[PDB]
């Protein structure tokens, strides 16, 4: 947790990054959204800043706050922080590049810390979507019902289980970076960097870099400030492209990873049990919209679908080898065939 | 009986005594963490308006 | 605003309690929201914090916020905090656990307060459902519409009119008044309370007495603190406990009773009135889904049912005792039985 | 950026009207929100408050926060200006009583302080368009969309193109304002003004006249003052009066004219166009509702509508005299009719 994942930290920077909801003209978001997801089944919604939040890049606590400003961390406190989704959040956790962030699911992301006469916030699009597994689906419960085995995410920072491509605290501007060679564009490394680059003068415009360096054209804004970082490794972002001449394609983990526990899930009560001869009387009146189906049983598939979200008495016909009833996507229910009301023959199917 | 408009039925108003099933269940918490939700079926005081 | 009602004040005590949402990594906030009340369907909702703000259990002065901590208050501001429904509000008055505040109407609450770029939230579901009283379903005046009489509640927190349990409650918050006296779990009354307690442990449990203290398991992390008061009654929260023991006439008022009054409401623009003979034509031009239905007053009774938000010219046959007509949740309009000839000479009605 | 035109900024100054919605359903600020322009279809809202931030009421200090508390101004920081739509957004220029900022996407716009240990803050509705005009009704844009050329607002303002009645404007508020002269009712000038007036009681009014009012009807709320500023004509606000016995000169433009531009924009995905014979195969895919429609060009018309966001193949009869093809806001594209193999026209598709 703050023990080891030094893999991330040390080996990485913020990076900052721009962002289109912002500035006079856009600010410079080293906070940048990339990769929501609230793609799980969850209620937590995992969000990407650019920003290596968490641990400052030291060793201790996942509640400061260090994003890029200059080429240099800005390790703070988080508290001038405000992550939001649709719906403002309450910080779970931060880990690497990637934070959590207790907040119903959301189209957009909306974080933003107040810095400068601007409020100097970023956002982004990504269509996200939870459910609850199974029958009923939503995107995300409504207050009710049984917790039942889907995806969600932990409270604690480490939370592996899968792997993102990462490249390298890739190519951003830094222009914190750019010294003058006298009179011409001259990059210099981040924290250590084969530094790709290339002004409208010759040098390599393919990103084929070990340490690309053109200081043959005058202006800093007709030259390619860019950072293959060759020991480090981040999050691979739109905002933050790669080269190809010492690029990493090695995948290194992403934290907050939704995974199997009981996540908050649905259910509306009121099946109402009843059998009366090789029939389910079944009176319903759920809390919230309940996918019901069934399957009387044998060879036989026979389907039901229905959502219910009001009183209705259904039926279903039980069969020689049963008829199961499945009252939402908690697991199916069981029922033998045969009259309840006294006095018959048996013996047979024929009496 | 909750189903029907007039699933919570109390007697006078000089009292609290009264019948309460509206089908007002209790589930789980938001976000799983302590509070008391009551999720309420549309029925009585909700449908039929 | 203010009140005089000791009934509840002195013979109640401040509470506060947890909420899900609280900034950085969670807290217990003293706007932790319990008990929401649709219950009016006006510019002013009641919401109810786990706290006592409001005067103190001594009385004066509603402009402090008293939570509990020990058996002691915690007087301080109500304005840096924002008790409301969920967008910003203007708080109207506190008093008790309860807060009348002019808010926009919700099922749901989300409660918080900037000060800064701090983040201090709290949220929480109880399923609620507003409309005004009558046909037209809405829940609340934007800033526009007629006015029409539904639930409202008053400014004024001196209201008495209905009174909710706060009846054998247990405790206060902050386990340092239900303490260890140094091995065993020590019930220490507010000023007189019939206490009424045990223990995971085998005693006593609960039942009609003055004495059903137990103290048998050493923590109060292994018994059920309460406090049940016989003159210091607190409201009895979804998250405060309340053994089942003696029953007390510690039924209490609520300063916010929604009552029947001219409400500020919501109405699409009143009925653009026609006639013919024995009809009253309604060429409607509506800002709001406003539920149209009448009833052909006398000798016939029918109903007639339309949602009307669309501009509709529709016709409702009135009979020989007029018609009345009510358009949405505003009370019924009428019209006289007979003939529209709209000005011609004798021996034309409307023939 | 600073005083482009000294017609607005100098002969301006704050001014308090009511504010017409809160965020629940009204309050009252120094900051009123009237006239928001979002009308160009672009990132950046045009909003006014009723307060004159900016430089403070002078010539310099641009993007400093002045509004008015009494006649006096209230010279505080713009970091404590919170513009805000989904969530805060960042200024880009201040120009009048007018800012533009460049805003997540929201249909109204909501401006508030943090100042005092209380929020007072304000937003409004204000009829804002953000689809490029002809056809196709597509959003705003959040961080995607394609960009073409419309209305767009300036980040680099100096604009004068429409003007606003400014001439005769009413007070500010405070009963400070509407004083009283020992017995009749006295307003008292902002900054120097001509000061008209009337009462319920019959006057004689002018408002190139310093001093008008009544002696028949006098007292703060027995009168109705205005301030008729003829060195700082304020904006004519719906809660500022205005005279009605002359009128005083003094409409002072409106800054930040939408122009035309590189917008920020919203054209759906493209498309894919094709022809065989006389045909206008048309593959489509876009992820937002582009109208398309056509015409079969000749004297021989023919119109087609069909709102686009699902991916379809349509078709549309390419005529002799061409097809024209108008893929929503984008301008009217051309076809002609010509056969895809073999044949000999010369009046018919191939004879």
């Given at each position: 947790?703050?023990?080891?994942?030094?893999?991330?930290?040390?080996?990485?920077?913020?990076?900052?990054?721009?962002?289109?909801?912002?500035?006079?003209?856009?600010?410079?978001?080293?906070?940048?959204?990339?990769?929501?997801?609230?793609?799980?089944?969850?209620?937590?919604?995992?969000?990407?800043?650019?920003?290596?939040?968490?641990?400052?890049?030291?060793?201790?606590?996942?509640?400061?706050?260090?994003?890029?400003?200059?080429?240099?961390?800005?390790?703070?406190?988080?508290?001038?922080?405000?992550?939001?989704?649709?719906?403002?959040?309450?910080?779970?956790?931060?880990?690497?590049?990637?934070?959590?962030?207790?907040?119903?699911?959301?189209?957009?992301?909306?974080?933003?810390?107040?810095?400068?006469?601007?409020?100097?916030?970023?956002?982004?699009?990504?269509?996200?979507?939870?459910?609850?597994?199974?029958?009923?689906?939503?995107?995300?419960?409504?207050?009710?019902?049984?917790?039942?085995?889907?995806?969600?995410?932990?409270?604690?920072?480490?939370?592996?289980?899968?792997?993102?491509?990462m490249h390298q605290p890739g190519l951003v501007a830094d222009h914190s970076l750019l010294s003058i060679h006298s009179a011409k564009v001259k990059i210099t490394v981040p924290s250590g960097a084969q530094v790709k680059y290339y002004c409208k003068c010759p040098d390599v415009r393919?990103?084929?870099?070990?340490?690309?360096?053109?200081?043959?054209?005058?202006?800093?804004?007709?030259?390619?400030?860019?950072?293959?970082?060759?020991?480090?490794?981040?999050?691979?972002?739109?905002?933050?492209?790669?080269?190809?001449?010492?690029?990493?394609?090695?995948?290194?983990?992403?934290?907050?990873?939704?995974?199997?526990?009981?996540?908050?899930?649905?259910?509306?009560?009121?099946?109402?049990?009843?059998?009366?001869?090789?029939?389910?009387?079944?009176?319903?009146?759920?809390?919230?919209?309940?996918?019901?189906?069934?399957?009387?049983?044998?060879?036989?598939?026979?389907?039901?679908?229905?959502?219910?979200?009001?009183?209705?008495?259904?039926?279903?016909?039980?069969?020689?080898?049963?008829?199961?009833?499945?009252?939402?996507?908690?697991?199916?229910?069981?029922?033998?065939?045969?009259?309840?009301?006294?006095?018959?023959?048996?013996?047979?199917?024929?009496? | 009986?909750?189903?029907?408009?007039?699933?919570?039925?109390?007697?006078?108003?000089?009292?609290?005594?009264?019948?309460?099933?509206?089908?007002?269940?209790?589930?789980?918490?938001?976000?799983?963490?302590?509070?008391?939700?009551?999720?309420?079926?549309?029925?009585?005081?909700?449908?039929?308006?």
């Amino acid at each position: 947790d703050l023990d080891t994942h030094f893999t991330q930290y040390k080996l990485a920077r913020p990076y900052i990054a721009d962002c289109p909801n912002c500035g006079h003209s856009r600010c410079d978001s080293p906070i940048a959204i990339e990769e929501v997801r609230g793609d799980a089944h969850a209620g937590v919604i995992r969000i990407q800043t650019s920003a290596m939040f968490g641990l400052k890049t030291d060793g201790v606590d996942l509640a400061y706050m260090s994003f890029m400003n200059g080429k240099t961390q800005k390790s703070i406190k988080i508290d001038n922080l405000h992550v939001r989704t649709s719906a403002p959040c309450s910080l779970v956790s931060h880990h690497g590049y990637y934070i959590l962030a207790q907040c119903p699911p959301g189209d957009t992301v909306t974080v933003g810390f107040h810095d400068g006469p601007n409020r100097h916030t970023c956002t982004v699009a990504h269509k996200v979507e939870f459910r609850p597994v199974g029958r009923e689906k939503y995107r995300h419960p409504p207050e009710h019902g049984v917790e039942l085995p889907c995806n969600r995410y932990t409270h604690k920072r480490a939370d592996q289980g899968h792997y993102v491509e990462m490249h390298q605290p890739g190519l951003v501007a830094d222009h914190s970076l750019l010294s003058i060679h006298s009179a011409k564009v001259k990059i210099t490394v981040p924290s250590g960097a084969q530094v790709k680059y290339y002004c409208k003068c010759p040098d390599v415009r393919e990103g084929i870099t070990s340490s690309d360096h053109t200081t043959t054209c005058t202006d800093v804004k007709q030259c390619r400030a860019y950072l293959i970082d060759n020991k480090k490794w981040v999050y691979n972002s739109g905002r933050l492209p790669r080269g190809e001449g010492d690029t990493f394609k090695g995948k290194l983990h992403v934290p907050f990873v939704p995974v199997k526990a009981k996540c908050i899930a649905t259910l509306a009560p009121e099946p109402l049990v009843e059998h009366k001869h090789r029939t389910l009387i079944l009176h319903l009146h759920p809390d919230h919209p309940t996918l019901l189906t069934t399957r009387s049983l044998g060879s036989d598939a026979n389907p039901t679908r229905q959502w219910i979200e009001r009183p209705t008495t259904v039926n279903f016909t039980v069969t020689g080898e049963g008829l199961e009833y499945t009252w939402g996507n908690h697991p199916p229910k069981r029922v033998w065939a045969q009259e309840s009301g006294e006095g018959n023959p048996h013996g047979w199917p024929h009496e | 009986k909750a189903g029907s408009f007039g699933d919570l039925q109390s007697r006078t108003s000089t009292s609290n005594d009264l019948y309460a099933n509206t089908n007002l269940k209790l589930q789980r918490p938001q976000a799983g963490i302590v509070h008391t939700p009551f999720t309420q079926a549309p029925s009585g005081f909700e449908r039929w308006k």
